[PDB]
Amino acid sequence: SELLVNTKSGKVMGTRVPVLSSHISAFLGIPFAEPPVGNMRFRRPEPKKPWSGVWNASTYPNNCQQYVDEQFPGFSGSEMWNPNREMSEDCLYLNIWVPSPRPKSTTVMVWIYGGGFYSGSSTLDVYNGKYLAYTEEVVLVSLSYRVGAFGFLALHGSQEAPGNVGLLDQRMALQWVHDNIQFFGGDPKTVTIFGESAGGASVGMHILSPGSRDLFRRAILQSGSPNCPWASVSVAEGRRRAVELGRNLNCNLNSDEELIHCLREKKPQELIDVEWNVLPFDSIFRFSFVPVIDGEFFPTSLESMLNSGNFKKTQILLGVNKDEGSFFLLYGAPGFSKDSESKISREDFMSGVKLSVPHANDLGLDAVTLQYTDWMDDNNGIKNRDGLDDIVGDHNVICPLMHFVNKYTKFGNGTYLYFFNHRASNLVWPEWMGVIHGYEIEFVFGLPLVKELNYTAEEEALSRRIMHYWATFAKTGNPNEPHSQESKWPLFTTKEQKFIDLNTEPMKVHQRLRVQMCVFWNQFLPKLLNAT
Amino acid sequence: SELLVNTKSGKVMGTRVPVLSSHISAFLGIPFAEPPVGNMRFRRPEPKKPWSGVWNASTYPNNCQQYVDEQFPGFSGSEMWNPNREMSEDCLYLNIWVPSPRPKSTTVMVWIYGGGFYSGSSTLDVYNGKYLAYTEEVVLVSLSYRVGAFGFLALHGSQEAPGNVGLLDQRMALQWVHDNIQFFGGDPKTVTIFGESAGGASVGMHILSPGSRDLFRRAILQSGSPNCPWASVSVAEGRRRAVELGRNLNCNLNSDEELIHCLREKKPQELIDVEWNVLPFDSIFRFSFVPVIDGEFFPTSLESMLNSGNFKKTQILLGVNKDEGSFFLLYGAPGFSKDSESKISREDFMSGVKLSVPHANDLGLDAVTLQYTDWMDDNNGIKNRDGLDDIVGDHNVICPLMHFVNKYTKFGNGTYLYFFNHRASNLVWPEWMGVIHGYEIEFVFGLPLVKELNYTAEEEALSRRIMHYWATFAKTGNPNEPSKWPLFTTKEQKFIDLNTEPMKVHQRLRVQMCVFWNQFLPKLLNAT
């Protein structure tokens, strides 16, 4: 019985799911931790205790409690990222797709959804793992972790709300794959962890954290890295926000114990409703509760760890999308609209930069402005719009990732960098937004392979080669297949710093992805803000 | 006689000179002040006392005492700027070229040579005023003024060496023209002063000085403005440098009188020998003795004066050359040579910027570096060379002039801006230096009009339209006669290229870099 598997915690019963004229096995909603409810809220996850009988694993599980986006009701472009299942604090489950017949000991890929650490689900349609697992014959795992206050509230010192529990939820799911995936036909010695945005930052954090290192073989980071400005906060800022949350709910602030006890008596939706009120300034691409540099999950500052090579040394494949910042400008910056060309006046441009670099002083602001302003034509609405898009994307995603890739490669054993710049022919978002943050995921999971989705033939071929790059990399540590005729994705080296564009046109090799801007963001601006 | 003129100080006998198969009158070496020698060194100029008899004005006068460039002996490119006659402290004279027959109340143009305030002569071949005076039929005057310590040693408080005497010398020459040009066929009410580099900065300073304003009608500034970073120092820096001069010569530094008396006993060449030893940093495009903001010649800071509109309001015609910085990189920056392409390594680039912005801190240097480095190819020697070239030109000439043009236009009565970017065909300097600082002068003075100089027919035509723009402007306030050189406005900020090709109108001359040098950097250095 392919569907009846017995794990270390009890038996589980999957289901036969159809896929591209064929079929595969699916195990949906398998628990890997105890429900972090009641007195468990904010606390480190605990291993799921053994159960008797057969666990029905044929339906998706609940999604964690989170802020839901209602900016555009009925609009698929945004609602495809919202929970598609009932939310509940009892959400620590994982899904698995296994080729049929069951492989013996094949490659395993574990997906970690993104969503700024304040949202995300393992059950979205865009994350349906059946297409990838089937086409590349890999065992695909989809995990989950607590988001928002529930997974990242941090009061350093306390053991009730220590912080980073969401990262620990992820670790426990990987520990489960390590101990049980063999029963599903996967080789636990060859597991690749891959994620996008907050997911990509997570993958990068496991690479740095000593406690996660032995739980996976290789890693793929898509549009996200550990050192991003939004991916973490100090213990001090974490406490400030934690104490600010209590104040917003008239909580007793006399002690961590009383504060935490107060926050535990509250209903999920009560914490969520005030979540954004704890932020330092008016801003965009900034999230209230994220990982904290505690000295535990993270030994020392992320920067010193990268400079000293204190991290798992292996092969990594990572990259970014052409327009990482448009999605966030649309939601929180003046002048942007989904139903318009969004030409930004000079006044709105200024407001946007302030919004994008909230931590900067007046001098740092002038520096940013000058760096992205064409003074021969400053009132050009289009240049001002695209300018802000580049600012937001470079500061928050692209440049932090380049910093990471350059630091990593000095110690790693094989780096591959990509630049995704293909605008899907069926995108429901406006043309000015370009290649949007997160829209490369549908190609990674093979959505283009299904006819009724209406992707072009060239997009299907692109999807097929991207999945092949990902899987092959997962299996061997090299996205290329030896002695093959197709163009080769070259290694990224400290010297030549090569990378390829990922699109429907023949491969192109480039060098130094946005070096000019990243020098500004990674070297110059910090020195400037550090002055006084 | 057409050559014998009676001025308010005495008679002068000129000389009939040949010019382009014709002739004109020339009155060379006319004294406009008393010889500033002996106890008069460092002191304000005093008017030339009347003389009996006829003053022989047939030959050029002596040039003032100055540092002489001996970097390239025999090489015409550098020597054409050196004194072409005996140097002496008694050097306050002027030259005049009058068309023949003597016109009536015609337009007058007064030339003020450049040279960083440490050098220059009115007698240089390239400043021969006969071609311009004849061709455009104007009375051309070229004056002289003390340079170096002799003309700019500043010891605010003292009246034996108060500072700015070189500018005061220029003022006395203009005053002299104001009272005597009429006797030469010139119109004292229609005088245009023009000069290059330090000469351009001087013109700008007269526009700002209350005591100079009534001495001229219009102004032309070529590659220089009063606000350039090298054109002036504070009273404190002036005194510090002055005292360091004494120290270098082992002078009594107990008081100003003692210091001055000591410095007045030294031979001219002794001072000149240690002149460069008083600069505060290792640098380029920086000079020891320059004008000082004393509160007298200059009421308040140049900036506050520019913002409040406290200055002469008239028409101005100013501009710059395409490669203002190459000449100074060649003399003081590592990696540069006259006999090679001069590809600049990365290390030399870094050395260069530090040399170019001596006052900036490390953050400021990184700012300049990032602003001029193409990181997709930083080890490119040609790009590093051109970057340093632009750095020196933008910081010292182009951007300070643009800041001036924008401030002046808000209160002025007409601005005309130009960008000179034509490379002379007979230039003796290497190609990497491009359109060099000061080489537009030869075009302004009509040198291309003489065959023996081997210029191209296209360049001669260029020289003719430049001389006509300059002259027509001087006489009406508009370079165009009734392609038109558009007026520069606060709104459109238009300017024209000046070359052998049909005119082209542009807008915002190097606005990107000048926003960096006029707004960002200043603010950054003040904050850190």
Ligand SMILES: *[C@@H]1O[C@H](CO)[C@@H](O)[C@H](O)[C@H]1NC(C)=O
């Ligand atoms: C498992 O759940 C699915 C979906 O409701 C159902 O079809 C199936 O019969 C269940 N299996 C059992 C017997 O629990």
Ligand SMILES: *[C@@H]1O[C@H](CO)[C@@H](O)[C@H](O)[C@H]1NC(C)=O
């Ligand atoms: C990875 O490590 C192996 C063994 O240490 C070495 O042979 C190989 O060259 C390395 N690969 C890269 C690209 O660093």
Ligand SMILES: *[C@@H]1O[C@H](CO)[C@@H](O)[C@H](O)[C@H]1NC(C)=O
């Ligand atoms: C004026 O001086 C020149 C040069 O010394 C001399 O040739 C000329 O004869 C003098 N003028 C006269 C004729 O007195």
Ligand SMILES: *[C@@H]1O[C@H](CO)[C@@H](O)[C@H](O)[C@H]1NC(C)=O
């Ligand atoms: C110059 O001033 C006159 C008289 O005030 C004025 O009529 C004219 O418009 C001004 N010209 C310019 C270009 O400012």
Ligand SMILES: *[C@](C)(O)CCC[N+](C)(C)C
């Ligand atoms: C990243 C900040 O985690 C953002 C991911 C957001 N979606 C919309 C692509 C899921």
Ligand SMILES: *[C@](C)(O)CCC[N+](C)(C)C
């Ligand atoms: C200006 C700094 O006064 C420099 C003038 C240089 N020459 C060589 C053109 C005289």
Ligand SMILES: C[C@H](O)CCC[N+](C)(C)C
């Ligand atoms: C990234 C995102 O759309 C933020 C959610 C909107 N606010 C901050 C207004 C609640």
Ligand SMILES: C[C@H](O)CCC[N+](C)(C)C
């Ligand atoms: C351009 C010029 O001759 C610079 C002056 C050179 N030193 C300092 C050596 C005297």
Ligand SMILES: [Cl-]
């Ligand atoms: Cl970088």
Ligand SMILES: [Cl-]
């Ligand atoms: Cl001749």
Ligand SMILES: [Cl-]
């Ligand atoms: Cl001589």
Ligand SMILES: [Cl-]
């Ligand atoms: Cl105007």
